[PDB]
Amino acid sequence: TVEKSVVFKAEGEHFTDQKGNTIVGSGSGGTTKYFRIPAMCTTSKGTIVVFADARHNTASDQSFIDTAAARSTDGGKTWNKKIAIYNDRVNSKLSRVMDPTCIVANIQGRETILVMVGKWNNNDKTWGAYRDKAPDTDWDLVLYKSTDDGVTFSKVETNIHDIVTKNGTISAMLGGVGSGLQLNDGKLVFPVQMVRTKNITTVLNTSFIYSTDGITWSLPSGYCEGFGSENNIIEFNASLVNNIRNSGLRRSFETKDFGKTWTEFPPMDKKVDNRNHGVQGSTITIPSGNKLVAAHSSAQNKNNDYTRSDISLYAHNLYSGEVKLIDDFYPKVGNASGAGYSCLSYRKNVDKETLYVVYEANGSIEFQDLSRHLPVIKSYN
Ligand SMILES: CC(=O)N[C@H]1[C@H]([C@H](O)[C@H](O)CO)OC(C(=O)O)=C[C@@H]1O
């Protein structure tokens, strides 16, 4: 409901910690240096909540990171900002909570926003390098919830570290990045990515965790293949269908038996090319009369490298398999330090439909209202 705004400004934000002290980052004036990995959830009140890594010192994945949250009640025009989740502060160089996935859901009648992030403290290498232990002792996956429309967040005591430990073949697990979903039966579903222990031949796999209450979670028995593992899931006739990052063409599989076996989903499989290395992308459904349409954002990556230019919106005809570029909403070369991620959010509140996007823009997170494209996306079925 603004057409375009900056949510978090690289070298332009100041945050305080739990005691009220400023967090002196490496940006000019001690600001947070860089923002990455935006996740957006919109509530039934019309409130927009945006999470992102506040990477205080560098754009690097292995650095000092807190999860920042921004809340807008005026359609994305102004943003109220704070830290939603603080890292443990064991190591000032490496302690981090990162890569948010959010869900807005009604759980037993209460509208709740959930945010899940991975947490590390002493690991100095990329998470894919730690495959000895089940799970890695430095890792954890933490879940916070808000029941007051995004204003306060508190930690949820979960059985997630236990189901991973009981599985015995997973070194670490992370959300798929962006947003999860609530199924038509009420269950919460987080798409997940997992690094398997060193003896499993596949390093990475994709799957999901599910819960009825947000507290006790379960893993299905099967695994989808991994590719670039960041992924989202959509519900389509109670198949669950994911859409996975891959170097080159994105992949899409379907489960008809709730996570026991996955087979390629032709309407979305290999339809968008993100070229070299791959990028995270956001995929959601939009109802169109009694049919569904899948809306998707990811980078065109015209330079075929880490600059991941041209973050675009696509519509996927779930019936015919046709794909159409609806809008290249950020038609710029990104910063190779960390670029190209995005998150879509669609909501219809009473009779008002909104389609919003948040994305990485040279270290900052930008917001755009894309609702003007809904007629065109809704026609693709
Ligand atoms: C936890 C973590 O490392 N996440 C990072 C992810 C990961 O490194 C890669 O998917 C290999 O596993 O890569 C990137 C990236 O811009 O490509 C950003 C994420 O923050």
Q: Is 157 a known active-site residue? A: no
Write the residue with the smallest CA distance to atom 9 of ligand 1: 228
Which numbered atom of ligand 1 lies nearest the CA of 128?
12
According to the entry, how was the structure determined? X-ray
- Contact at 8 Å (CB) between 126 and 61? yes
Separation of alpha carbons 199 and 173, rounded Å: 17
For residue 235, what are the contacts with CB-CB under 8 A and spacing of at least 6? 181, 183, 184, 241, 285
Catalytic residue among 341, 346, 356, 359: 341
Phi and psi of 194, rounded to 5°?
-145, 145
Domains of the chain listed by start with CATH number: 1-381 (2.120.10.10)
Element (H or E) spanning 378, and its range? helix 374-378
Number of neighbouring beta carbons within 10 Å of residue 49: 26
CA of 38 to the centre of ligand 1 (A): 13
Binding-site residue numbers for substrate are 36, 245, 308
Q: Is 322 a known active-site residue? A: no
CA distances from residue 125 to 42, 62, 116, 121, 259 in whole angstroms, order as listed:
34, 7, 21, 11, 30
Residue numbers after which the chain breaks, C to N beyond 2.5 angstroms: none
The resolution in Å comes to 1.6
